[PDB]
Amino acid sequence: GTILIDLSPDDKEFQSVEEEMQSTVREHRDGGHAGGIFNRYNILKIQKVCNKKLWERYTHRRKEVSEENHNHANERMLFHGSPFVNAIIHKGFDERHAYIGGMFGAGIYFAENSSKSNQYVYGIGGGTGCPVHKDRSCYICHRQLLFCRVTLGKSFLQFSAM
Amino acid sequence: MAHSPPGHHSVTGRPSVNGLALAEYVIYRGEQAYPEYLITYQIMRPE
Ligand SMILES: O=C1Oc2ccccc2C12CCN(c1nc3c(c(=O)[nH]1)CCCC3)CC2
Numbered sequence: 001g002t003i004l005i006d007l008s009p010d011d012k013e014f015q016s017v018e019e020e021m022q023s024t025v026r027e028h029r030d031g032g033h034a035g036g037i038f039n040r041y042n043i044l045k046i047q048k049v050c051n052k053k054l055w056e057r058y059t060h061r062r063k064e065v066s067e068e069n070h071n072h073a074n075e076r077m078l079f080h081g082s083p084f085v086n087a088i089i090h091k092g093f094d095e096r097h098a099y100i101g102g103m104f105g106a107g108i109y110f111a112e113n114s115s116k117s118n119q120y121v122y123g124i125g126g127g128t129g130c131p132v133h134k135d136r137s138c139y140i141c142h143r144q145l146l147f148c149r150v151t152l153g154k155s156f157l158q159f160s161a162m
Numbered sequence: 163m164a165h166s167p168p169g170h171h172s173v174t175g176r177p178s179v180n181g182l183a184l185a186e187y188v189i190y191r192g193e194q195a196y197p198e199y200l201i202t203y204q205i206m207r208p209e
């Protein structure tokens with residue numbers, strides 16, 4: 001059901017999404033251990049994910065949540081990095097994509113910092129790095145992140161010690 | 163998957179020590195996110 005539409009680097013939509021990626025890189029307290037050492041990305045491709053059944057399933061839940069939160073979906077665009085990105089764009093998010101040991105409970109996690117989600121493209125803590133070179137800071141292998149539409153509704157604010 | 167806190171649809175995890183670290187968010191239902199853009203990229207070695 002899923003179709004991928006390539007955006008042109010000359011399209012303002014491509015440039016806007018790249019801008020969100022580049023401008024939300026930060027330094028991480030692990031010195032780069034998990035996601036590698038870098039200040040910016042080389043963006044190779046940005047594709048729109050089109051799936052009618054997944055979108056209708058998303059918008060149906062969004063409507064429900066909206067009606068439960070003084071008519072406010074509280075919808076954000078947030079990054080998600082994961083070894084299972086191929087399963088996510090074809091089948092959607094579900095509990096197998098949930099971080100069981102996350103600081104805020106077993107659920108599906110998203111980041112405002114693109115570089116935070118980059119720490120998880122090869123797994124938790126960067127796993128063993130890229131499959132070809134076993135290098136968490138690989139500058140050669142291609143990585144993939146998702147930039148997702150996320151309905152937060154009424155969000156419980158939890159301050160962390162990070 | 164866990165449940166969200168009662169009366170809430172998600173959790174906002176907000177770093178309180180590193181002022182430059184942005185927020186992290188958790189949802190507990192797959193239907194509350196849509197993977198809109200797939201971004202293929204490399205990290206670049208600092209010059
Ligand atoms: O990496 C994984 O390996 C497995 C292996 C099995 C199940 C789930 C996972 C995740 C766990 C956590 N995942 C993730 N966590 C976070 C952020 C993010 O983009 N992805 C950004 C905010 C900080 C937390 C991806 C899926």
Ligand SMILES: [Zn+2]
Nearest residue numbers: 130133138141
């Ligand atoms: Zn590699």
